[PDB]
Ligand binder design. Structure first.
Ligand code: N5U
Length: 342
């Protein structure tokens, strides 16, 4: 077996000429030369089988990415594992290699207004398909937006995705949450489990703001600080928006704060296109019921050069793991990956 950094990275004779990339969210990832399709590919090694929560996220991603087929969503090209459940310890997921990502690009490149527009279009076009499948991504951020040399954009990492469940979204105040802090909507900290499509639109809003200035807009240093940063820019919520929060601990926390003024977007982003700021405002709306939806966002004047609903496909087949034990989830991972065996 191929070895990388002194660890097994056993991708078989199909995949040769390995090169270390890094230790991605759930293990090692390498590029490799695909001897069948004659291109370099990305391969991540997953070792989830000792833990039920890791089985769950691995299975979630595999099931979702195998069903989805969309230009702005990363596919799965191939899955490598042992021929039997007993011998299966690792799974290698093979995907199109993408030269960079929006996190890397934002750390050293100024984006033109045309690049911002085109990136936002592609994010929303992918997101339209995801939401049309009744799925929430729940971890949109620059590092999950892959880009190739011609700036084609693909959304990555469906490990934290869920089927939407708006009727069960309500929870109490300061309920712990899994997804990345700077891109978390204000309601996560107040009264929401992140089971509605509006949680993804907030994340896209944060990404848009980050494209405009190369700095995260709400860089919270820990959990409740994130809400401090959001309110610092949006200002104090209105009475109507407070009345939408029935939970008393969350309501009374917001009422306890001194008045904070809205910072105008054109002062924060003096070089931005005014249409980009109007769409930004609508994505970063405090009240998630008033927040713009993905299809409205595509139809916004900022994106008029690209908007074409007939070329913005939806899923044909929209989508309990939570308490299946890990033994059962290994079997389901084995089954979900069987089509890639000879
Ligand atoms: C979800 C992000 C991810 O898997 N990658 C981006 C960072 C490098 C490794 C991954 C990559 C590169 N090209 C394609 N893919 C999936």
């Amino acid at each position: 077996p191929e070895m990388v950094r002194g660890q097994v990275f056993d991708v078989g004779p199909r995949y040769t000429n390995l090169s270390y990339i890094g230790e991605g969210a759930y293990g090692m990832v390498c590029s490799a030369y695909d001897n069948v399709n004659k291109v370099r590919v990305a391969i991540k090694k997953i070792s989830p089988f000792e833990h039920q929560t890791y089985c769950q996220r691995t299975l979630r991603e595999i099931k979702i990415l195998l069903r989805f087929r969309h230009e702005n969503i990363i596919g799965i090209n191939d899955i490598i594992r042992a021929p039997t459940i007993e011998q299966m310890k690792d799974v290698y997921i093979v995907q199109d290699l993408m030269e960079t990502d929006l996190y890397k690009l934002l750390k050293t490149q100024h984006l033109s207004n045309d690049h911002i527009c085109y990136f936002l279009y592609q994010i929303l076009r992918g997101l339209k398909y995801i939401h049309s499948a009744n799925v929430l991504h729940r971890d949109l951020k620059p590092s999950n937006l892959l880009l190739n040399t011609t700036c084609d954009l693909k959304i990555c990492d469906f490990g934290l995705a869920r089927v939407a469940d708006p009727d069960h979204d309500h929870t109490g105040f300061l309920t712990e949450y899994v997804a990345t802090r700077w891109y978390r909507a204000p309601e996560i900290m107040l009264n929401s489990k992140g089971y509605t499509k509006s949680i993804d639109i907030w994340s896209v809003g944060c990404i848009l703001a980050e494209m405009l200035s190369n700095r995260p807009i709400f860089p919270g240093k820990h959990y409740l600080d994130q809400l401090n940063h959001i309110l610092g820019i949006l200002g104090s919520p209105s009475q109507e928006d407070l009345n939408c929060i029935i939970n008393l601990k969350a309501r009374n926390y917001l009422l306890s704060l001194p008045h904070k003024n809205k910072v105008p977007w054109n002062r924060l982003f003096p070089n931005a296109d005014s249409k980009a700021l109007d769409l930004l405002d609508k994505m970063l709306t405090f009240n998630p019921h008033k927040r713009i939806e993905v299809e409205q966002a595509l139809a916004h004047p900022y994106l008029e050069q690209y908007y074409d609903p007939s070329d913005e496909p939806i899923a044909e087949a929209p989508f309990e793991l939570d308490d299946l034990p890990k033994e059962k989830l290994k079997e389901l991972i084995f089954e979900e990956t069987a089509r890639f065996q000879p």
